[PDB]
Structure formats: C-alpha cells, structure tokens
Design an enzyme around this catalytic site. Structure first.
Site, PDB file in Angstrom:
ATOM      1  N   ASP A  40      91.184  26.267  49.059  1.00 27.26           N
ATOM      2  CA  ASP A  40      92.221  25.344  49.535  1.00 27.26           C
ATOM      3  C   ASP A  40      91.605  23.954  49.619  1.00 27.26           C
ATOM      4  O   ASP A  40      90.384  23.827  49.860  1.00 27.26           O
ATOM      5  CB  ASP A  40      92.737  25.769  50.906  1.00 27.26           C
ATOM      6  CG  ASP A  40      93.433  27.121  50.866  1.00 27.26           C
ATOM      7  OD1 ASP A  40      94.413  27.252  50.099  1.00 27.26           O
ATOM      8  OD2 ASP A  40      92.989  28.072  51.573  1.00 27.26           O
ATOM      9  N   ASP A  95      93.663  30.967  55.770  1.00 27.07           N
ATOM     10  CA  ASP A  95      93.679  30.657  57.203  1.00 27.07           C
ATOM     11  C   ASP A  95      94.766  31.337  57.987  1.00 27.07           C
ATOM     12  O   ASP A  95      94.586  31.558  59.191  1.00 27.07           O
ATOM     13  CB  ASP A  95      93.612  29.137  57.505  1.00 27.07           C
ATOM     14  CG  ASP A  95      94.813  28.367  56.970  1.00 27.07           C
ATOM     15  OD1 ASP A  95      95.021  28.355  55.732  1.00 27.07           O
ATOM     16  OD2 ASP A  95      95.541  27.754  57.777  1.00 27.07           O
ATOM     17  N   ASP A 137      97.664  34.559  54.263  1.00 21.54           N
ATOM     18  CA  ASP A 137      96.470  34.561  53.390  1.00 21.54           C
ATOM     19  C   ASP A 137      95.722  35.881  53.508  1.00 21.54           C
ATOM     20  O   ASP A 137      94.860  36.174  52.690  1.00 21.54           O
ATOM     21  CB  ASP A 137      95.464  33.459  53.764  1.00 21.54           C
ATOM     22  CG  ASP A 137      95.957  32.064  53.457  1.00 21.54           C
ATOM     23  OD1 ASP A 137      96.360  31.811  52.298  1.00 21.54           O
ATOM     24  OD2 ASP A 137      95.900  31.217  54.396  1.00 21.54           O
ATOM     25  N   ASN A 188      56.291  55.848  56.167  1.00 27.97           N
ATOM     26  CA  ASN A 188      57.538  55.366  55.606  1.00 27.97           C
ATOM     27  C   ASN A 188      58.377  54.613  56.615  1.00 27.97           C
ATOM     28  O   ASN A 188      59.167  53.741  56.260  1.00 27.97           O
ATOM     29  CB  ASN A 188      58.313  56.527  54.989  1.00 27.97           C
ATOM     30  CG  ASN A 188      57.584  57.142  53.812  1.00 27.97           C
ATOM     31  OD1 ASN A 188      56.602  56.584  53.319  1.00 27.97           O
ATOM     32  ND2 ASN A 188      58.068  58.279  53.348  1.00 27.97           N
ATOM     33  N   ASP A 204      54.604  51.187  56.278  1.00 28.21           N
ATOM     34  CA  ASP A 204      55.150  50.356  55.210  1.00 28.21           C
ATOM     35  C   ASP A 204      56.372  49.549  55.662  1.00 28.21           C
ATOM     36  O   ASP A 204      56.753  48.590  55.002  1.00 28.21           O
ATOM     37  CB  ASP A 204      55.510  51.195  53.987  1.00 28.21           C
ATOM     38  CG  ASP A 204      54.317  51.870  53.370  1.00 28.21           C
ATOM     39  OD1 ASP A 204      53.189  51.631  53.844  1.00 28.21           O
ATOM     40  OD2 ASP A 204      54.512  52.649  52.408  1.00 28.21           O
TER      41      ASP A 204
END
Ligand SMILES: C/C=C(/C)C(=O)O[C@H]1C(C)=C2[C@H]([C@@H]1OC(=O)CCCCCCC)[C@@](C)(OC(C)=O)C[C@H](OC(=O)CCC)[C@@]1(O)[C@H]2OC(=O)[C@@]1(C)O
Ligand SMILES: Nc1ncnc2c1ncn2[C@@H]1O[C@H](COP(=O)(O)O)[C@H]2OC3(O[C@H]21)C([N+](=O)[O-])=CC([N+](=O)[O-])C=C3[N+](=O)[O-]
Ligand code: NA
Length: 994
Positions: free
Chosen positions: A351, A703, A707, A796, A800
């Site tokens: 817009d 808005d 919309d 894991n 890491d």
C-alpha cells in the site's frame, strides 16, 4: 438476501413477508432460525490436550526415538549385571527428552492466537429488534437475530448483522466502517436502492455491516444476512479456506526425516547381512540371548546417533534472538519460521499511503483564472510552503511572498476550502506536532486556509491550539452551512449548501461550494470566476485548466489535484431530495470554476533507498494505491519503481482495467505489473494467487479486516502497527512504524539469519553422520561399543549445541543484498558438499572407533592386546588366546569410551571452526572472526571435564578421567580433521571456479 442493497425497502419487506411496524411472528422466527441458522460465526475446533500431546508424537524422528526408548527400557529390564541405578538411566533420558519436547509443543498452542477467533471481537452480545409478540423494542442476544428481523440501531451501537436500512429516525445516520472499507471518517447512510447488483461495500450506502459502529443518529432496518453470509462472515470463510504451506526449511526437515528413517532401517539390514555367518554357528553353546541384546543395543545407539536431537532447540534459540533483534528495527515477527520465508521474499506488494508515503498531505500549488479574452487566457499560479499540517508556511508568486487576500479569486478559493470540508486541525500537546482530524486530503485544505489568511485576522497574537483553526473560524462566521452532499466515488465530488449568516428579509444568495476530482467537476462548470466577475466557460479556458492539471498530476510534482467550484444559483432548498445520493451530481451542475489545488503526500525519506536495495536484491516491488492511474504512475517514477522515461502501458493497471482483462491476461499482467491503482480488497487476493502461480514468495501489506484474507494468503502478510488487531493476527510480521523500509530491512535480516542457520544445520547434521559411521563400524567389525546413547545424547544436546548456537552469530556476508532471492527448493547439502560430509563422516567414524580400539590394544594403561582383535570374541567362556590368568570383563571398561568420546568432542570443536565458512580457508577467515564461537568452545570443553570429574557424572556416563598421554592421543587423531576440510575447501575453491 445478499442483493438487499439493490432492492427497495418495500421489496425487502415483501421478500421476508414481514411487516415493518410489527416485525417477525414467532412462527416466522422459528422457521427463519431453522432455515438460516443462528447469527454467529462457527466456533473454533475444540483441540483437546490429549489430542495435542499425541500430535507431538506424530513426527517421524520422535517416533523412532520412542521406539528406541522402548527397546532401551526393555533392555534395562532383561539384563545381566547388578547396578540398579546405572541401568534405567538411558531410557529415562530419551523419555524425558520426548516429554520436555511435548511440554513445549503444548506451551506454544495454549499461547497461540488465531485470526478467525479475533474476528469475534466484532460480534456484539446484544441487539434490538421489533417482533410481533410485543409492542416495544426488545433487546435480545445477537446470536438469536435472523434475516427478516426488524432491527433498530442507535449511536454507539455495534451493528449486529448485515442490515438493509428501512428508515432513518434522526437527521443523518453516520457510521464507522473503517474496519471494513478503510473509510476513516464516519460515512453518511441513505435508504434508496443502490442499482448495481455487484456494488462494492463502499457504495452500499443503504446498508449497515455487522461489526461496524453507529457514529451518529438512529435507524430502523431489516436484517439481510447473518452468520457466515454477512461481509465479515464471508471474510471469515475466505480465511478458513486458505491453507498455508510449510516453510521451505520445514519441508526440507521433513524430507530429511523420511530419508533418515529409511537409512536407519537400511543400516540395520546391513548389520544383519554382515553377521549372516552366525547361521553357521553350532546351535549348541554360545549365547543367543547375549547376541540379540547386542543387535538391539546398537539399533538404539543407531537411532540416537542419527537424529540431531538438539537441532530444533538451536533453531528456536537462533530464531528468538533474531526476532528480538528485528523488533529493535521495528519489525515485529509473529511467527518464528517466517524469518526464513521473509529472507526468500521475491515480491513485495505495498500500500502507498502511510507506508511508502508519510501520509502528511500538504498543498504546495494552486491557481485561479487571471483573465479570459477570446482565444486568450491567463492563470494566476501560486506556491505554498510548509510540508507540515502546521500552519507554518506562506504563499508565493514567483518565489516572492504575497498577500493572499489581495486576490478576490483566492478569497473564494479559501472560502470553498474552508466550508466544503468535514475535517479539521488539532494541536496535540502531548507531542507538539499537529495531527489530522479526519480525511488527510481535507485537512490539507484546512491547513491551506490558515496559511492563506485571506482576511488578515490577527494570529501572531493567539497561542498554539487557538492557532489550529483561526482563519477557518473566520470563514465559518460568514456562511450558514445547511447540509452537505458527501463525496461518492461515482461523481468524485462533494458540495455544501450555504446561506448567508447575516441575511435580513432576503431569501436569496445561497451558494453551493463544490470540491472534487478535476475532470467531472470541470465538465459541470458553465462558468469561470475572474476575480469577482464571471464569464462563460469556453474551449481555450478549459484547455488551459486541464493542461496544467495534467502537468501537476502526471509530472514530477506528483500532486493530487482538486478542482474547486461554486454554484452561483443553486436550486431552491425545498426542491432538493437530500435522501437520494443519485441526484447529487445533478445538484452540482451549472457550476462556476474557481480554482485548483495541488497537494503532495511525500515519499518517506528512506523509501527511495530501499526501493534501490530491492532492485539490487532481485526483489520486485508492486505499489497498491488509491490515486488515479496517471498520478499512480508518476509516483512510481518518483520513488524509482519505474524509470523516469520507461514505457509502462502494460505495467500499471486500475482495478477497472484489470477486471476487463480475461483470466489468462490477468495472470500475465501480474508477472510484469508494478503499479495497481483503485483496486478492491478482492484484487489483493487475486494478485497473490497469480503471483503464487509463478512460484513467487510474496509479501503483501494490509491494515483492515478486509485485508485479512490477502494477508493470510501471502507467504508474508504484513500488517501496520497502526492497524487493526485482526490484520495483525492474520500476518507474519507487523511494522511498528508502518514504514516500507522496515520491510526491506527485515528481508535482509532474514537472509543473514538463514545463512547462519545453514552453517549450524550442516554442522550438527554432519556430526550425526560421523556418529552413525562409528556405530556402523562398531557392529561391522564386532567391536565393543565405543559410544553409548547417553554419551551421544550429551554431545548432541550440550557439547555441540553451544557451538551450533554460536554459529548463528556468524558475521553476515557484505553482499547479502547484492544477490537474487534464494530459491526455495535449494538443498542445504548436495553435490561436492555431500562428498565433503561423506568424507568427514568416514573420518570421524574411523577416528572414534580407532581411539577405543587403540586403548584396548596399543595403550600401556590397558591390556596391550596388539592385533589381538576384539573382533575375535566378546563371548568369554572359550578363553582361547589368554593362555593363563583370571580376568575378562575389561570389555566394559570406561577408559576406551572416554577415548572415543573425547575424540568426538574434540573433532566437533574443530569442525565448528570448519563451519564458520562453507568454502573459505581458516587462513583467510580465522576463528576469531566470531568471538562467541571461541567462547562456546571453551564452555563445551569445560563441561566435558565436568562429566569426567564431578563424581556423580563419570559413573552415569560410564567414563574415566583421561591421562595426559591419552589426551595427547586424542589431539593427535582429532586435529587432522582441520587439514582434511582445508584440503576439501581448497578443491572446491579452485577446480570448480566457473
Ligand atoms: C544423519 C545421519 C546419517 C548417517 C544419514 O545417512 O543421513 C543422510 C541423510 C538423511 C541425508 C544425507 C545423509 O546421507 C548420507 O550420509 C549417505 C548415506 C551413508 C550410509 C551410511 C552407512 C554406514 C546428508 C545429511 O549428509 C551427507 C553426508 O550428505 C545430506 C542432506 O541433509 C540435508 O540437506 C539437511 C536437510 C535438513 C540430505 O541428503 C539427507 O537426506 C536428504 O533428504 C537431504 C537432502 O536432507
Ligand atoms: N476506487 C476508488 N475510486 C475513486 N476514488 C478513490 C478510490 N479509492 C480511493 N479513492 C480516493 O483516494 C483516496 C484515498 O487514498 P489511499 O490512501 O486509499 O490510496 C480518497 O480520498 C478522496 O477520494 C478517495 C475522498 N474520499 O472521501 O475518499 C474525498 C475527496 N474529496 O473530495 O474531498 C477526494 C479524495 N481524493 O482522492 O482526492
Ligand atoms: Na500469510
């Protein structure tokens, strides 16, 4: 009755068989309730806690983990040692991970807020009806209202259904419809039919829409539609029916899951095929029970080694942090996964007003007619300074201040500006800066007359709130404003009827003052004012006027023009039907042209720059505006969407023109168009559909409630900070400053976050391959487990997990916005990279198995059984190659597990460095390029010592503190992984340089 606005009041009453003065009978109510249902949007699906806890367990990888948990639990039971605490640890961890996972999945759903549910804010609890069973108006629950109901509304009421207005009981009926039409000022309503059966809502001036508010007056109506049939109900159905896709990374993660699960089963089959010689063993002796536990032990370790368990958490952490960073730059991201999509945006539909522009409207040019003499004509043009709604500025002719009042034509121009005007000015003392009170275009006029000060009233003396409306108040004391004929999109004008304020025994001298879009206003002028005189409108005067308007509206000034005009002899007051808007054009005929004003709603200061950034990044920008087409295109040129001189005949479209194209041409229009003018809310949805047909990843601004569907359909719905909560809840992102530039900055942020995510995804998954090779090696060679689930799980999740998270903070590439949008289908790992992680994986597998096997053999702390091979057995009743002694169960020692684990740990720290850059050597992009990463690597190693030393833990993980000798071996074997990658990076950077 959907087409109610086009029917007469009589026809609407006839359709429902209802009397206006009684309303519906109770038999009618019962029948209408049964036919039409209750007046409400359907309730949300009740998604239960149990039904939701189960959804957590639908992900394929969590299923594998659950299966593994059960085999681990089953094994913890049917066992052979004595330690009661050390056994059920493994299955508790996995179980706990699955549970914590579920806890979180659930947290996110109780806190999830949905768009469809927010629409319900707009249904009131009660409404008022007249029904046959009682004389007086009865207040009932909105939900029990039906079509055909005679309903009554009054000021402050929330409209309860879509109602055809029958009778307006006050002088006017004014309604706040902003949420549905984006009309800011309350709109006047009438009762006459609107003929077009396809009228847009803004033209339905005889209709009240459910969910809107009465701003003034009182009215009786008949309920046309209820429930899902109202305008807002149809908006709720469009949203309901919109299915949103998984983000590209979600899709890749699922694809990874499927494949990983197939690989796992394949490796099990492999470990079976590899030990097929066991069918050759004598059935008597050995242990089947202790062999079968061995295949199930590894299946579990395999599942645990394959899944990147810590990955979802890393992804989430990285996304939350990015989110927090984006918010500081006015981009409020509502959906964490949208970050990736935003990084992939290829079209932004925006817009104009308030987003691309400041929505501070200001008049900077005007003109009146100077003189008319046959073929000759001249105009008196002025400039006006001051880009604020503030009365700070002055009028100039040829850059020299002048006295506005000294031109009678100007006096009338200002008169019209002041009277033909519903808006005003406010000096907001909480801020200091002036703010519009109504329509932006109108307040520009209000602001104009103050600067013009046509009667020279003493304003330097007044304050700052007494400054807002001074010269205006002067003009109001002049004329009694009787009524106004509101603006409508067909005639594109509005007028006011006025009578002298001072007026003794005189019925004469009433004026209409008219303002509107130039073309229709001017066509309805038969006269031209010249000072205080008047002359016939003729051809060369009209040419002159339209010619200037063309240049102001289509030239580089990009101004909105309004023509101003007065009807000198307006109809008698009694001869006017104020109730039929259809006649209003006709009342505004036989006009005298007074002048033209041109006003600018300036582009935001950063917009030009961001438009350029988009071109640089291969992102198309489409402007959506309510300007006429000529001014639309001019503004696109001004901000650089089109070039100053490029052909745009088929790159800009009005809603009108676009509708007139056949379906195939409309799709084609969308691929090349950059400018849509005067379009309806339906068009935003169609534009998005067409754009999705060419696989664009589209951002769309919005808005209002109208919309909401398009925002839901677009990959990135973008709501205004200043907008409705419904638009907000239907969007991926909210702009807290409404600024288009916030979009561009969010996209760049998306690109940089995603590039970091790539590195840490590749890093974590890389280690999972490395781990699986270890487990598969172990089961291939008949070795004792080098690593157990619990260890792998700590690595894991924790070891890491930190460096992965630190890789999220990798500095972004300088040319992030100098490359096209990333293809959504682009693999995270493929081709040469695949090969790299193949090789690293194989290295890591060998390195871990190696360290455990090195301790068992060549290490002088352990039973130096060199080439003695664990291959041989893990049977121990045959006691073949230990010719004398009494010791065996050293096959369960924690030391060789500690060798493997510290190798894994160390390699992974090394490989986190390898992951800073895909292809750049550490000789060009060194470790200290990311401080957080070094910092995290120090933290992980510290924690590795924690589990090695802090007594409860070594036992839990089955580990023993290493020797300075053994650490040195850990380093010997672990460090070369850097060499291998540096070689592999070299190969890519040089023999693939095209
Ligand atoms: C996780 C651990 C392992 C052991 C598993 O093999 O992962 C594979 C796998 C599922 C993929 C592969 C792994 O493939 C192999 O490693 C080859 C099989 C080796 C046989 C082992 C015998 C002892 C990834 C991991 O690694 C390598 C080395 O190429 C790359 C990539 O992964 C990604 O792109 C990340 C997407 C989230 C995927 O090919 C991916 O499958 C896909 O669909 C992708 C596109 O995903
Ligand atoms: N589809 C349309 N058809 C005709 N005009 C339109 C349309 N859509 C918007 N406009 C005009 O573009 C506007 C919003 O822009 P945005 O920020 O939304 O892109 C509008 O403002 C006025 O006319 C409207 C107006 N008015 O009441 O609406 C009254 C006017 N007046 O006479 O006082 C004139 C307006 N004007 O545009 O000049
Ligand atoms: Na969306």
């Amino acid at each position: 009755m959907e087409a109610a606005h086009s029917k007469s009041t009589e026809e609407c009453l006839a359709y429902f068989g209802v009397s206006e003065t009684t309303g519906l009978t109770p038999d009618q109510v019962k029948r209408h309730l049964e036919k039409y249902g209750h007046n409400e949007l359907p309730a949300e699906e009740g998604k239960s806690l149990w039904e939701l806890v189960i959804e957590q367990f639908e992900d394929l990888l969590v299923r594998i983990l659950l299966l593994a948990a059960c085999i681990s639990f089953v094994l913890a039971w049917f066992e052979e040692g004595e330690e009661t605490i050390t056994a059920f640890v493994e299955p508790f961890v996995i179980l706990l991970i699955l549970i914590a996972n579920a806890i979180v999945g659930v947290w996110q759903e109780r806190n999830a807020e949905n768009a469809i549910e927010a629409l319900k804010e707009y249904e009131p609890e009660m409404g008022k009806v007249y029904r046959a069973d009682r004389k007086s108006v009865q207040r009932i629950k909105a939900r029990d209202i039906v079509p055909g109901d005679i309903v009554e509304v009054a000021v402050g009421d929330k409209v309860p259904a879509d109602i055809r207005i029958l009778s307006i009981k006050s002088t006017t009926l004014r309604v706040d419809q902003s949420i549905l039409t984006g009309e800011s000022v309350s709109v006047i309503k009438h009762t006459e039919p609107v003929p077009d059966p396809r009228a847009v809502n803004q033209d339905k001036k005889n209709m009240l829409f459910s969910g809107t508010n009465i701003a003034a007056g009182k009215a009786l109506g008949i309920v046309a539609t209820t429930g899902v049939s109202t305008e807002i109900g149809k908006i709720r159905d469009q949203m309901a029916a919109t299915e949103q896709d998984k983000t590209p990374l979600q899709q890749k993660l699922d694809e990874f899951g499927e494949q990983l699960s197939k690989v796992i089963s394949l490796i099990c089959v492999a470990v079976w095929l590899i030990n097929i010689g066991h069918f050759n063993d004598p059935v008597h002796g050995g242990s089947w029970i202790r062999g079968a536990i061995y295949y199930f032990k590894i299946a579990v370790a395999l599942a645990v080694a394959a899944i990147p368990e810590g990955l979802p958490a890393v992804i989430t952490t990285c996304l939350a942090l990015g989110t927090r960073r984006m918010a500081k730059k006015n981009a409020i991201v509502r959906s964490l996964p949208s970050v990736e999509t935003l990084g992939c945006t290829s079209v932004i539909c925006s817009d104009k007003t308030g987003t691309l522009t400041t929505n501070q409207m200001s008049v900077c040019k005007m003109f009146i007619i100077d003189k008319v003499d046959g073929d000759f004509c001249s105009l008196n043009e002025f400039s006006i300074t001051g880009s604020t709604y503030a009365p700070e500025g002055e009028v100039l002719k040829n850059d020299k201040p002048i006295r506005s009042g000294q031109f009678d034509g100007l006096v009338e121009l200002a008169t019209i500006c002041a009277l033909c005007n519903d808006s005003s000015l406010d000096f907001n003392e909480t801020k200091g800066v002036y703010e519009k009170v109504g329509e932006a275009t109108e307040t520009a006029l209000t602001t104009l007359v103050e600067k013009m000060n046509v009667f020279n009233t003493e304003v330097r003396n007044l304050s700052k709130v007494e400054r807002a409306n001074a010269c205006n108040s002067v003009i109001r004391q002049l004329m009694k404003k009787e009524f106004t004929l509101e603006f409508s999109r067909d005639r594109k004008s509005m007028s006011v009827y006025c009578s002298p304020a001072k007026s003794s025994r005189a019925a004469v001298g009433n004026k209409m003052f008219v303002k509107g879009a130039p073309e229709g206003v001017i066509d309805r002028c038969n006269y031209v004012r010249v000072g205080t005189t008047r002359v016939p409108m003729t051809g060369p005067v009209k040419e002159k006027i339209l010619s200037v308007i063309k240049e102001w509206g289509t030239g580089r000034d990009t101004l909105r023009c309004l023509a101003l005009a007065t009807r000198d002899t307006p109809p008698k007051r009694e001869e006017m039907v104020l109730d039929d808007s259809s006649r209003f054009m006709e009342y505004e005929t036989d006009l005298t042209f007074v002048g033209v004003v041109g006003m600018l709603d300036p582009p935001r200061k950063e917009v030009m720059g961001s438009i350029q950034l988009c071109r640089d990044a291969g992102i198309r920008v489409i402007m959506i505006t309510g300007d006429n087409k000529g001014t639309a295109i001019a503004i696109c040129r001004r901000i650089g969407i089109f070039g100053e001189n490029e052909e745009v005949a088929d790159r800009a479209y009005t809603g009108r023109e676009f509708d007139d194209l056949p379906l195939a041409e409309q799709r084609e229009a969308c691929r090349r168009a950059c400018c849509f003018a005067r379009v309806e809310p339906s068009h935003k949805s169609k534009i998005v559909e067409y754009l999705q047909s060419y696989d664009e990843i589209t951002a769309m601004t919005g808005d209002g409630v109208n919309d909401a569907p398009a925002l839901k359909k677009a990959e990135i719905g973008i709501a205004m900070g200043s907008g409705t909560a419904v638009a907000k809840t239907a969007s991926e992102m909210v702009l807290a400053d409404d600024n288009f530039s916030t979009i561009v900055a969010a996209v760049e942020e998306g690109r940089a976050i995603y590039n970091n995510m790539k590195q840490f995804i590749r890093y974590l998954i890389s280690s999972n391959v490395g781990e699986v090779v270890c487990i598969f090696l172990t089961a291939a060679l008949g070795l004792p487990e080098a690593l157990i689930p619990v260890q792998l799980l700590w690595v894991n999740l924790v070891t890491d997990g930190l460096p992965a998270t630190a890789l999220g903070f990798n500095p972004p590439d300088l040319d992030i916005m100098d490359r096209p949008p990333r293809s959504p289908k682009e693999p995270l790992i493929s081709g040469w990279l695949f090969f790299r992680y193949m090789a690293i994986g194989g290295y890591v597998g060998a390195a871990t198995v190696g360290a455990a096997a090195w301790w068992f053999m060549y290490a002088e702390d352990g039973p130096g059984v060199t080439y003695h091979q664990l291959t041989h057995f893990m049977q121990c009743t045959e006691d073949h190659p230990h010719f004398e002694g009494l010791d065996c169960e050293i096959f369960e020692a924690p030391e060789p597990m500690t060798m493997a684990l510290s190798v894994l740990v160390t390699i992974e720290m090394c490989n986190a460095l390898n992951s800073l850059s895909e292809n750049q050597s550490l000789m060009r992009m060194p470790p200290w390029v990311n401080i957080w990463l070094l910092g995290s690597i120090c933290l992980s190693m510290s924690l590795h010592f924690l589990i090695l030393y802090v007594d409860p833990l070594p036992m839990i993980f089955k580990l023993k503190a290493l020797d300075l000798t053994q650490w040195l071996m850990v380093l010997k074997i672990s460090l070369p992984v850097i060499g291998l990658d540096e070689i592999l990076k070299f190969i890519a950077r040089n023999y693939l340089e095209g």
